[PDB]
Amino acid sequence: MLAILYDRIRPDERMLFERAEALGLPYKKVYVPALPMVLGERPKELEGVTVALERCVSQSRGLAAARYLTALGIPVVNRPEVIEACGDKWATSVALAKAGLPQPKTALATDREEALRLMEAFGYPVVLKPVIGXXXXXXXXXXXXXXXXGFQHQLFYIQEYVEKPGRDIRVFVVGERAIAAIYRAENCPLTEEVARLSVKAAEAVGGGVVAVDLFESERGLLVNEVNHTMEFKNSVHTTGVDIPGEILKYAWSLAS
Amino acid sequence: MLAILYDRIRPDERMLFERAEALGLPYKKVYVPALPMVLGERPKELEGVTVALERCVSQSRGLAAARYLTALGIPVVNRPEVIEACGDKWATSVALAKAGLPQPKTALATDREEALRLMEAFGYPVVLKPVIXXXXXXXXXXXXXXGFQHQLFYIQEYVEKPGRDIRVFVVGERAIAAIYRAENCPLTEEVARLSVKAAEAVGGGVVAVDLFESERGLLVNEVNHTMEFKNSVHTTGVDIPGEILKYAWSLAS
Ligand SMILES: Nc1ncnc2c1ncn2[C@@H]1O[C@H](COP(=O)(O)OP(=O)(O)O)[C@@H](O)[C@H]1O
Ligand SMILES: Nc1ncnc2c1ncn2[C@@H]1O[C@H](COP(=O)(O)OP(=O)(O)O)[C@@H](O)[C@H]1O
Numbered sequence: 001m002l003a004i005l006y007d008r009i010r011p012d013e014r015m016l017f018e019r020a021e022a023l024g025l026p027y028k029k030v031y032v033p034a035l036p037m038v039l040g041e042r043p044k045e046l047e048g049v050t051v052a053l054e055r056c057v058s059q060s061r062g063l064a065a066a067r068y069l070t071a072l073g074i075p076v077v078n079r080p081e082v083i084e085a086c087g088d089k090w091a092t093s094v095a096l097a098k099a100g101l102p103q104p105k106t107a108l109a110t111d112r113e114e115a116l117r118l119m120e121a122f123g124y125p126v127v128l129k130p131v132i133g134x135x136x137x138x139x140x141x142x143x144x145x146x147x148x149x150g151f152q153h154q155l156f157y158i159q160e161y162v163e164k165p166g167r168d169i170r171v172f173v174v175g176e177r178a179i180a181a182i183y184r185a186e187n188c189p190l191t192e193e194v195a196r197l198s199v200k201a202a203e204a205v206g207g208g209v210v211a212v213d214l215f216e217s218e219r220g221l222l223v224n225e226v227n228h229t230m231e232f233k234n235s236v237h238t239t240g241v242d243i244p245g246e247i248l249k250y251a252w253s254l255a256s
Numbered sequence: 257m258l259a260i261l262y263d264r265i266r267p268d269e270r271m272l273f274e275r276a277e278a279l280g281l282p283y284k285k286v287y288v289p290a291l292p293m294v295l296g297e298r299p300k301e302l303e304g305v306t307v308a309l310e311r312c313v314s315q316s317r318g319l320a321a322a323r324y325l326t327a328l329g330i331p332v333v334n335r336p337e338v339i340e341a342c343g344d345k346w347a348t349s350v351a352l353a354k355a356g357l358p359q360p361k362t363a364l365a366t367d368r369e370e371a372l373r374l375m376e377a378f379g380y381p382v383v384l385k386p387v388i389x390x391x392x393x394x395x396x397x398x399x400x401x402x403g404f405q406h407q408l409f410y411i412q413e414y415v416e417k418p419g420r421d422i423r424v425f426v427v428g429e430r431a432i433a434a435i436y437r438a439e440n441c442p443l444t445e446e447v448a449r450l451s452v453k454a455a456e457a458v459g460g461g462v463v464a465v466d467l468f469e470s471e472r473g474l475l476v477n478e479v480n481h482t483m484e485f486k487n488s489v490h491t492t493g494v495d496i497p498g499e500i501l502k503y504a505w506s507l508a509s
Binding site: 032033034035036037038039040058059060061063064065067068070071084087090091093094097098103105106107108109110111113114117118121132133150151152153154155 | 288289290291292293294295296314315316317319320321323324326327340343346347349350353354359361362363364365366367369370373374377387388403404405406407408
C-alpha cells in the first residue's frame with residue numbers, strides 16, 4: 001500500500017487524501033516527526049508499505065526521511081538525489097548546464113571579494129539569490145551592502161538580470177508528461193515547445209514529480225527553477241486538471 | 257595537465273606539490289577563493305586542465321568547485337556525490353546500510369521529543385553527533401543537551417572496544433596503508449576488504465575509513481572525503497601522496 005509522509009497538513013495534502021479515497025487506492029497517513037528511524041529495523045507504522053510519497057513541509061526533514069526509505073528498500077517518489085538536486089540552486093543550475101538546457105547566465109563565488117568582481121563583470125543591474133531556501137543590485141554600493149548583511153557556508157549565487165517580454169510560466173511535470181501550466185493567474189494552454197523543455201528539465205535533475213518555472217525572455221524560453229515538492233491548491237481550478245490524482249497514480253505505478 | 261584546487265595551504269598540500277614535482281607530473285596550483293565560476297565559460301586558470309584534485313579545507317567551498325568542474329566536463333577526484341555522501345553522517349550511514357556493511361546501531365530524529373524516545377529506547381549510555389561529540393549518561397543529561405541540516409539528531413549506541421580505532425587509506429580499489437589512532441597497523445585481508453567496500457559504498461575514489469574493533473567484530477564508523485596524512489607517511493612508511501596523484505592522473509580526460 002501507498003504511504004503519504006507528512007508533517008504539517010496543508011490544503012494540498014488534504015486534497016491528496018481525498019483523491020486517494022475516491023480512487024480506491026490503498027494508503028495510510030504517516031506523521032514523520034514521530035516516526036522512529038533506526039537503520040536495520042522497519043517501524044510499525046511502515047508495516048505493509050510498498051511505495052511512499054514524500055510530502056513534508058520541512059526540506060531537511062523530508063530529505064532525511066527519503067534517505068531512510070531507500071535504506072529500507074522502499075521506493076520513494078522523489079528520490080533523495082532529486083530532492084537535494086532541487087533545493088540547491090547551484091546544484092540545479094549545474095544539472096541544467098550538463099544537460100545542455102537554456103538558462104540565465106549564472107555564476108557562483110565563495111568569498112565576498114570574488115562576488116563583487118563578478119557582479120562588476122556581469123554589469124549592473126544584477127541579481128543575487130540564496131543558494132538554499134530575491135534582490136536586484138543597482139550599483140557597487142548596493143552590492144557591498146547586501147554581501148555584508150553546512151555545505152552552504154559563504155556561497156554567493158549571482159545571475160544576470162533578464163528582460164522579459166512575456167509572463168513567467170509554471171509547468172507541472174509528472175514522470176515523462178507535462179500535465180498543466182499557468183501564468184504566475186491565468187491558465188497557460190501548454191504548447192509543444194513549453195511541454196518539451198519542461199520534461200527535459202525534470203529529467204536533467206533525475207526525474208519524478210516537479211514544477212518547472214520558466215522565463216519568456218528576449219532570447220526565448222529560459223529555465224529558472226525546478227521544485228521537488230510542488231504546491232497546487234489554486235492551480236487545480238485555474239487549469240481544471242486533476243493534479244493530485246495524477247501524482248498518486250504515478251507513484252502507485254512504481255510500487256515495489 | 258593536473259590541477260590541484262586549494263584554499264589554505266597545509267603540510268598535506270605542501271607534500272602533494274613536492275611529490276608531483278619529483279614524479280614529473282604536469283600540474284598547476286589553483287586558488288579557489290579567487291576563481292571565477294561562470295557556467296558556460298571556462299576560466300583562464302583552468303586552461304589546459306584535464307583532471308583535478310579537490311583539496312580545499314572548506315567543505316562548502318570544495319563541493320561547490322567540484323560541481324563546477326563536472327559542468328565544464330573535467331573529471332574531478334572525489335566527485336560531488338562522494339564529497340557530500342561523506343560530509344553528511346546520515347548520508348554515509350544510509351549508504352553503508354544499503355551496501356550491507358557492519359556499523360553501530362544508528363538512528364535519526366527530526367524533533368527534540370523524538371530524540372528522547374530513541375535515546376530511552378536505546379538504553380543509556382548513548383552517543384549524539386552533529387550531522388555535519390558528546391556521551392549522554394542518563395535522562396537528565398539528555399534533556400540538558402537537547403539548510404538541509406535543520407534540527408536533525410544523530411543518535412548512536414555506545415560501543416565497547418576491546419581494541420584500538422583503525423584508520424585505513426583507500427585509493428580506488430586498494431587499501432594502501434593503515435594506522436592505530438600512533439603505531440602502524442599491518443593491513444590484514446579482513447581490514448583491507450571491509451575498507452574498500454566502504455569506499456565503494458559511498459561512490460569510490462580516495463577516502464580514509466575509520467573502524468572500531470568491537471565485541472561484535474569490525475564496525476565502520478566514518479568515511480572521510482579529503483584525508484589528512486602528514487604524520488601517517490612516516491608511521492606507515494608508504495608514499496600516500498604519490499599514490500593519490502597517480503590515481504588521479506590515470507583518470508585524465
Ligand atoms: N534573473 C532574474 N532576472 C529578472 N527577474 C528575476 C530573475 N530571477 C528571478 N526573477 C523574478 O523574481 C521573482 C521570483 O523569483 P524566484 O526567487 O526565482 O522564485 P519563483 O520564481 O519560484 O517565484 C519573479 O517575479 C521573477 O520573474
Ligand atoms: N558509537 C561510539 N561508541 C563509542 N565511542 C565512539 C562512538 N562513536 C565515536 N566514538 C569515539 O569518538 C571519538 C571520535 O569520534 P567521531 O566523531 O566519530 O570522529 P573520528 O572517529 O573521525 O575521530 C573516538 O575516540 C571514537 O572512538
